[PDB]
Design a binder for this molecule. Sequence first.
Ligand SMILES: Cc1cc2nc3c(=O)[nH]c(=O)nc-3n(C[C@H](O)[C@H](O)[C@H](O)COP(=O)(O)O)c2cc1C
Ligand code: SF4
Ligand code: SF4
Ligand code: SF4
Ligand code: SF4
Ligand code: FES
Ligand code: FES
Lengths: 430, 66, 212, 54, 230, 41, 59
Amino acid sequence: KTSFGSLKDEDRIFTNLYGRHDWRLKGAQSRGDWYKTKEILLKGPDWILGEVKTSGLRGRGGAGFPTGLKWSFMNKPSDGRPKYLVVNADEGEPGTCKDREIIRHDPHKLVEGCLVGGRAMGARAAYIYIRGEFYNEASNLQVAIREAYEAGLIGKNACGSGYDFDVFVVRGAGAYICGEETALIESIEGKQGKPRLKPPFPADVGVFGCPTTVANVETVAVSPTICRRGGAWFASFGRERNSGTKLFNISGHVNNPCTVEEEMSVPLKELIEKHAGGVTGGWDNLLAVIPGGSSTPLIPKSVCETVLMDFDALIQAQTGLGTAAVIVMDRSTDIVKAIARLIEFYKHESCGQCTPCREGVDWMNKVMARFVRGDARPAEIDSLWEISKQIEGHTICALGDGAAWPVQGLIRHFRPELEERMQRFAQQHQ
Amino acid sequence: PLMGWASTADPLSNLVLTFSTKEDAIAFAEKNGWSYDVEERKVPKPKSKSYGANFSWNKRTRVSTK
Amino acid sequence: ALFVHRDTPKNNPETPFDFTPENYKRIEAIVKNYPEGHKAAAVLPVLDLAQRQNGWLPISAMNKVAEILQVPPMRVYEVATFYTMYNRKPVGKYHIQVCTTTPCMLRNSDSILEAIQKKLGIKVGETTPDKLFTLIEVECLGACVNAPMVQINDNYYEDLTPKDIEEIIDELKAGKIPKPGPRSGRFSCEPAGGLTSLTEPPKGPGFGVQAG
Amino acid sequence: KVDDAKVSPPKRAEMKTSMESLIHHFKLYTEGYQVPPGATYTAIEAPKGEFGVY
Amino acid sequence: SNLIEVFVDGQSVMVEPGTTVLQACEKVGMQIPRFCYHERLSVAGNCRMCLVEIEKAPKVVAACAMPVMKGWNILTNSEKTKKAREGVMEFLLANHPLDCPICDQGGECDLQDQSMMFGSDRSRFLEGKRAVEDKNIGPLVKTIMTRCIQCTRCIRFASEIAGVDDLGTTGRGNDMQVGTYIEKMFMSELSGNIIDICPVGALTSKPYAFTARPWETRKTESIDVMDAVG
Amino acid sequence: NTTYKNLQHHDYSTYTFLDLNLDLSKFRMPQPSSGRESPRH
Amino acid sequence: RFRGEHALRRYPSGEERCIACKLCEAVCPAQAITIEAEPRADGSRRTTRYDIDMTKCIY
Ligand SMILES: Cc1cc2nc3c(=O)[nH]c(=O)nc-3n(C[C@H](O)[C@H](O)[C@H](O)COP(=O)(O)O)c2cc1C
Ligand code: SF4
Ligand code: SF4
Ligand code: SF4
Ligand code: SF4
Ligand code: FES
Ligand code: FES
């Protein structure tokens, strides 16, 4: 077992972070793509599922559902209805640039992985959904699809064997909800993006009524590397439930805010300072730390100086780990103002299926406005606590839950600044 | 003709007798003498609907809006 | 933001609106991708073609898309009023989206907001008394790892400062367009310290694998 | 009054700005609150005597 | 032979396969309160009222669109079922205007009856209360769209019985205007049957509009004319 | 390697997404139909 | 707070304060209120007939 883990070189799952040697299928072959994949494909998809569960891939995008269980649900016997694979590539949790880097510098390993996922579960066509903010990177993806087609190696009868597999690209139109699990599916359907109800699973009824699934881009990227490499070489980096490498990125308040691959666990102070410049004003300047992005409660200073960066560790810290915005914020900003702007974002992007997220984000936006102006009573801040207990899990999707959790973290940790703000408003009016 | 009201020569016009079974209703009506018209009870018919059937593939039951 | 039409001609069908037969071949490629039986799924790519052809879509464009895809128009009106990329108000050549939510605002987007405001003159959310400067601030776009960001027509700008504001706006006045990528060096999303990424040329298919 | 607004009507301030209290005002004065089935008796001391109500 | 065992608070009953929790609960007499479900239409889930704590599950789930596995037990009178009903009923009455005098569904509301029998009493949400201005749908149907609780029942009725497809959702978040976008006076057959569909006072009769409130008028059996079906 | 291997993204024009979708339309298995050609036929 | 004359009020330099919302006839324990309502040519809902029986009024 490692002593909390760090980056050892060439154990990077994917190289070519930015602007490296070329941008081509030839460069993909030099970096390790299209190498001996047919012998992996023609062995049987049960062996690929065994390889993935040997690696023990924790599902990405900040959900927690592991890939092995999902794609083992995808082993339904094939009926007259086909099977579909949908590669989701939106970037919610503002602070992200998770797969922007991947789809900007290496679409070829994504092509490898969607071919692997299409073979590994009986899928037949793969729709890749890019965010509508990404026209130029989408056209880079189109150039890469043209190169992979012009090689004559995907499309129809891939790898020389009689196995056709087509991949399409659907743009976004700008949303947070199109990134989610099932509003994606109906946004492809031409109806407006709205999630379905969960106990009919996407692996039973999906895109118009076919057993489909949805994969994150990090899962698609890691998937052919586990096929072409050894079993549990990926699993030797970190703990037993969560295992492998992850993009820990500071998009936020450090000197040189940037992106690094690391292993599953890391000491947080080494992560923040010994890789990405330094904290703006030193280690003792920041007020707090948010991991995850925006669907995660905060972590204060006395907790962030000690807590390691694991999924089980953040379960023990009552939060949820996501991607790429594992950032600090300074005392010089008001965290009430920052979380209130995040609640304004939540109001600006949410569909109107469920009554409780709709009206709860309405109350929380107006009440956080009355907290920034400070025109309330302490019964109001405990009422905000009560409604954040009411909303959570009583919806379809997790946007209501991810609007409940930052209010929870702010109430659990930063009571005294709220009390002093309200006392200063009392001194102002009186 | 002085206020615009609805007078009536009907003392029995505002009777109602809420009962629990049709048998005791008919028994009381035949016991107290006057005639009676029996209309039969109609429950709502049980149906067969599902959200997955509202998301059909090649069946025409399709929500078309959401 | 006034989600009812209320004609106001320069709208008010029929506004004369028609495409190019080359774009009709794009339309046939688009409804040839999707399977037969569910033609109504290509509404958003056809309406994207309408926006890329004519910079903002009128109501006659929506009647045209409804008659092309042989659907009732109400689904087209739903998809037009639902998403973000489709601006039913008329806009200019260039379109400014100043993205500022969680890393972007917390990394001091307000300097960029002040710079855009006192350089361009028109207030936030509104339009300009010419073309090419329809300014709106927007929520998250995804490209978060840098300074708060600016999207212009299918291009990005990160790592900003008010002198870069002056430069980019004066060069869009001149017509010469800078790069979509980052600024201040660091030619991609980079760890901008001492290159803490991989350095060796990667082996790939050569070394130890199993069952392959 | 009691702090059980489904029996006693609320007062004017919450009545003119609530929602639950306006609904309770409205339906409480139209229908009357429902009373569970059963037969009770009580009796207090009227200055005559046993004022009983059944 | 095609039976499913459920316990309704201990009382066992048998369920046909494929059906809902709600049809079996209405089979044993328990009317779970509903706002979006209606038996002449398809099943939306957007009103969220039918939540019920089904055992061995930390999350409380809807009952109008739940497939029925074998061997349930359905706790309707639990604690957090009542707490979820209190929460949802408190959410509905926030952006709903004080129009119960000038409404036309005083005796026949649904918010009023179900907020007496299931909701809270002391309100909250001091300020706010946005309002959506009405439209002009048709001179036969008077329409106020501030009272619309956006329940998506008239939309499903249009697209699944009327086939006209003129009513739609516009917007996101709080701002969802429900109607026709293009100032078109919606005139079609069975457009008089939308005032009985709309569960709240948002789509009322225009010629009836302000003559009575339905506790005075007595209800009487009769047979239709002018159509050979009755 | 500390050199920006991209700028392959830099030349992207505002038509290129539909251009790539246009050119990569071959080897398209028939996107399986279901009864009628449309929800309203 | 004496209960006498059964008078009506009106708005400040405004129209009739009543809406004809029938609450008083719904509560009137001798049913002396008689309300028949119609809207006028303007659009706001109003009355036609608002009668108090002084015989039945128990006050
Ligand atoms: C609130 C919410 C927001 C999401 N945002 C995104 C997003 O921006 N991009 C994305 O690709 N997936 C997004 N997802 C989906 C998750 O990434 C989900 O895990 C994915 O469908 C499958 O990932 P996994 O199989 O690796 O767990 C979101 C899901 C939820 C509930
Ligand atoms: S919680 Fe809100 S955003 Fe999520 S599905 Fe329900 S209505 Fe839509
Ligand atoms: S108009 Fe009535 S039926 Fe239609 S969504 Fe609104 S409340 Fe529901
Ligand atoms: S529909 Fe609304 S305004 Fe009308 S009676 Fe019910 S709660 Fe009051
Ligand atoms: S109908 Fe009666 S209760 Fe209603 S406003 Fe008129 S006088 Fe008042
Ligand atoms: S918040 Fe500005 S890009 Fe995500
Ligand atoms: S009745 Fe099930 S959610 Fe509306």
